[PDB]
Amino acid sequence: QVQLVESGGGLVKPGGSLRLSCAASGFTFSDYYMSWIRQAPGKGLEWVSYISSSGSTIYYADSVKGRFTISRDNAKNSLYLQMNSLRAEDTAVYYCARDFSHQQLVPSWGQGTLVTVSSASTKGPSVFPLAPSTAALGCLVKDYFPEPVTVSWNSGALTSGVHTFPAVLQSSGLYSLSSVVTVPSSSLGTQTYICNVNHKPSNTKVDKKVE
Amino acid sequence: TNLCPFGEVFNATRFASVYAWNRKRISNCVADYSVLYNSASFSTFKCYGVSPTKLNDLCFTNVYADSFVIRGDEVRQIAPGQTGKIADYNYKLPDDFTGCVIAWNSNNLDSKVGGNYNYLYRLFRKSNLKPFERDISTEIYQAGSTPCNGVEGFNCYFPLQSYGFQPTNGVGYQPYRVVVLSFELLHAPATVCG
Amino acid sequence: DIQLTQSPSFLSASVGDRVTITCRASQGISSYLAWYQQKPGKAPKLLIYAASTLQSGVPSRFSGSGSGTEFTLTISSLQPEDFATYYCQQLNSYPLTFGGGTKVEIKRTVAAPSVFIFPPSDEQLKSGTASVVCLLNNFYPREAKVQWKVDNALQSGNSQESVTEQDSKDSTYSLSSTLTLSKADYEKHKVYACEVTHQGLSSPVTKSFNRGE
Ligand SMILES: *[C@@H]1O[C@H](CO)[C@@H](O)[C@H](O)[C@H]1NC(C)=O
């Protein structure tokens, strides 16, 4: 089951540093070249750096040359990126990816990590119900930072009819969210509806029952 | 008179990588070849033209000692008549070779937890090495018919693959330090004796 | 530094239509190319690699072609679940370069927006900032004017909105305009109403509520 689990990431005071880690399973990792490719919010794919299958060879983009240090450990199959002197511009989702073996030109990517380079202290959101008046109820996620939130309705057991929206960046500098789920009007007094928010950046996990 | 600095060659702190194997010229001295044998700390000790006993009883015009690092999977190839990744593209001994090949396991000194990425062999080469030839090229090799423009990429790979030396490795992929003694005889007088 | 030139930037098609995308490389790259499909904020996923060959688990409708400079990706019968951005990647020489990317829309029969409206609950007023929300649910197409009236008075600039992506099933968008008010401005006025205008509606729909049921 080829899979690259990435980890680390998050809110870095500009000028600081962060490490990015990529746990490789499912293949002979020591055969494959590897790469670090970042993607600004809703912009292209920017390749940043790579490392040979043996770690003999290494190159960096001019956008990160000297600033980032890429590395691989081949017994623990991981691949590492040490990012120093982070800028405003360096804010991106960062992806690791197998580029190719000597023999199988078959890429594959990891789930990414939100490297969010700014000066704002992390704040936990507030969660208010969007109670019903077929019926429609929801959840209100307000005043959090940085991204992301995750909303899940009845613990991932209610996924039919959910629309969780994008984060609106308020004038205060804080993100707001909204997540709503439509339901059988008749099933309202019988079935209990609870929304689960989880904000790993501030270690906040709330469960509001909606009624 | 003088002693042969064989102790500088074996017990040296730095060894070179195979592709740039380090050869040193030993001359005008006397060393004990029985004493090298009487180590019994060498895992490999094979001599090819000479008896390890009759070596203290000999004189040659020049003694040549080449020092590099390989892995154990690869030690069987530092021998005449061997074909392999190392035996072809890194360091090849002729078929008339008279000499000794000595190698021991250097995993304690020559590997690191993060990856000792400093020793390298030539995985890719257009043709086989001539015996005792050194290739130091870092041209970006070409496997498939698309050219390379000097950069690496699919079917255009960098010729030098770093050994990924970690101590947790298995025996075959652990570093073995190696020294090859070749013994030359030419019309010039003898300089290395017993 | 091989540049990739991919067209179109944006294509819109209906279910079962044959989408065709072109990526042209600024030099010979002779089949060292892959094709990815990236849903929003998600990892790019592999569909085609080696210019023509279909990854395991990628529906047979997807297909690649080309060698040298001209490369095409083809969806022989588009699906409601192919709404994405599609990139090509050049693997011939590092740095790895990518195509521009092609967004893909799904075209569907007009739908009307079910419009619910929601109050500042009963907790936000402990915080002094009330928030009214207006939900425009399951409409097509993407364009919609939401209008916030507090006592038949137009509110500009105190309202933020965001829109989902196309449903993986029926291609409708949903939208939420969030109005923000101080506790004193929410207590200052009675009728709060949300005026929605959309292609699917013959006349502008307005759901209201009275502070105090
Ligand atoms: C290397 O060191 C050991 C310990 O001093 C010594 O006995 C051995 O003979 C040395 N090797 C050579 C080739 O001199």
Contact of A122 with A12, CB cutoff 8 Å: no
Query: Do C8 and C103 fall within a single domain?
Result: yes
Tokens 């190319």 locate to C33
Q: What is the dihedral of CA B9, B13, B14, B15, to 10 degrees?
A: 50
Residue that finishes a domain, picked among C92, C107, C122: C107
Same structural domain for residues C120 and C190?
yes
CA distances from B32 to B26, B42, B103, B111 (A): 13, 16, 18, 31
Residues B126-133: contacts with CB under 8 Å, at least 24 apart: B128/B88, B128/B89, B128/B92, B129/B88, B129/B89, B129/B90, B129/B91, B129/B92, B130/B92, B131/B92, B131/B93, B131/B94, B131/B97, B132/B91, B132/B92, B132/B93, B132/B94, B132/B182, B133/B92
Instruction: For Cα atoms A180, A181, A185, give the angle at the middle one, nearest 5 degrees.
Output: 130
A197 DSSP β-pair partners: A151, A206
* Best residue in A28, A54, A69 for a mutation probing chain B (most B CBs within 10 Å): A54
- Name the DSSP class of B9: H
Contact B67, B21 (CB under 8 A): yes
B183, two tokens = 């013994």
Q: Could you tell me if C8 and C102 lie in one domain?
A: yes
C33: left (phi over 0), alpha (psi -120 to 50) or beta: beta
Site of tokens 């207590």: C187
Experimental method: X-ray
Q: Are both C103 and C120 inside the same structural domain?
A: no
DSSP E strands, chain A: 3-8, 10-11, 18-25, 34-39, 46-51, 58-60, 68-72, 79-83, 92-98, 108-109, 113-116, 126-130, 135-144, 151-153, 162-164, 168-169, 175-183, 193-199, 204-210
Total count of domains within chain C: 2
Q: What's the distance, CA B98 to chain centroid?
A: 15
Q: What are phi and psi of A182, to 5 degrees?
A: -95, 150
Q: Are C91 and C34 in contact (CB under 8 A)?
A: yes
Nearest CA to ligand 1 atom 7: B39
Tell me the residue range of the domain where C103 lies. 4-107
In what helix (H) or strand (E) does residue C209 lie, and over which residues does it extend?
strand C205-210
In chain A, what is the straight-line distance between the N-terminal and C-terminal CA atoms, in Å? 43
C-alpha A111/C-alpha A108 separation (Å) is: 10
Tell me the DSSP string of B38-54. TT---SEEEESSS-SST
C139 shares its domain with C49:
no
DSSP states along A120-131: PPPB--EEEEE-
Contacting residues for A26 by C-beta, under 8 A, at least 6 apart? A1, A2, A3
- Return the residue of C nearest to A60 by Cα: C95
- Note whether C100 and C184 are same-domain residues: no
The four Cα atoms A15, A18, A20, A21 give a dihedral, to 10 degrees, of 160
Q: Are residues C78 and C138 in the same domain?
A: no
Nearest CA-CA partner of B52 in B66, B38, B42, B62: B38
The answer on C101 and C150 residing in a single domain is no
Contacts of B146 in chain C (CB under 8 A): 28-30, 32, 92
Buried-exposed string C26-59: b where 16+ CB fall within 10 A, e elsewhere: eeebbbbbbbbbbeeeebbbbbbbbbbebbeebe
- DSSP 8-class letter at B5: T
Paired with C24 in beta bridges are: C5, C70
State the distance between the two ends of chain C, measured CA to CA, in whole angstroms. 64
Q: Whose alpha carbon is nearest atom 12 of ligand 1? A: B7
CB atoms within 10 A of CB C172: 20
Q: Identify whether residues C102 and C118 lie together within a single domain.
A: no
Q: How far apart are CA B185 and CA B98, in angstroms?
A: 10
- C112 phi, psi to nearest 5 deg: -95, 145
Please give the Cα distance from C164 to B113 (Å, whole number): 48
SS (H, E, C) C11-78: EEEECCCCEEEEEEECCCCCCCEEEEEECCCCCCEEEEECCCEECCCCCCCEEEEECCCEEEEEECCC
- Burial-class residue C118 by CB neighbours within 10 Å (0-12, 13-18, 19+): buried
Q: Which residues of A touch B158 (CB under 8 A)?
A: 52, 56-57
Q: Which domains does chain A have, with CATH numbers?
A: 3-116 (2.60.40.10), 126-210 (2.60.40.10)
CA Rg, chain C, in Å? 23
Whether residues C101 and C152 fall in one domain: no
Contact A211, A131 (CB under 8 A): yes
CA distance A70 to B119: 19
Count of beta carbons in the 10 Å neighbourhood of residue A7: 13
User: Residue C153's domain is classified under what CATH number?
Assistant: 2.60.40.10
Residues C97 and C10 in one domain: yes
Q: Give the separation between CA A68 and CA A3, rounded to whole angstroms.
A: 24
CA distances from B146 to B14, B16, B28, C33, C192 (A): 39, 33, 53, 13, 68
- Alpha carbon distance C95, A63 (integer Å): 12
For the stretch C122-126, contacts whose Cβ atoms lie closer than 8 Å and that sit 24 or more positions apart, written own/partner, are: C123/A126, C123/A128, C124/A128, C124/A140, C124/A142, C125/C183, C125/C186
Is residue A115 classed as helix, strand or coil in its secondary structure?
Answer: strand
Domain check: are C16 and C100 in the same one?
yes
Which of C64, C79, C107 corresponds to the end of one domain? Answer: C107
Q: Helix, strand or coil for residue B107?
A: helix
Angle CA B52–B62–B44, to nearest 5:
35
CB burial readout C173-194, b (16+ within 10 A) else e: bbbbbbbbbeeeebeeeeebbb
Of C39, C72, C107, which residue constitutes the final position of a domain?
A: C107
What resolution, expressed in A, was reported for this entry?
3.4
Q: Do B154 and C30 touch (CB under 8 A)?
A: no
**Residue C88: burial class (beta carbons within 10 Å; 0-12, 13-18, 19+):** buried
Q: Which residues in chain B (90-149) have CB-CB distances under 8 A to chain C?
A: 145-146, 148-149
Beta-carbon separation of B151 and C32 below 8 A: no
- Measured in residues, chain A has a length of 211
Query: Which chain B residue has its CA at the smallest distance from C2's CA?
Result: B149
C-beta of B13 in contact with ligand 1 (< 6 A): no
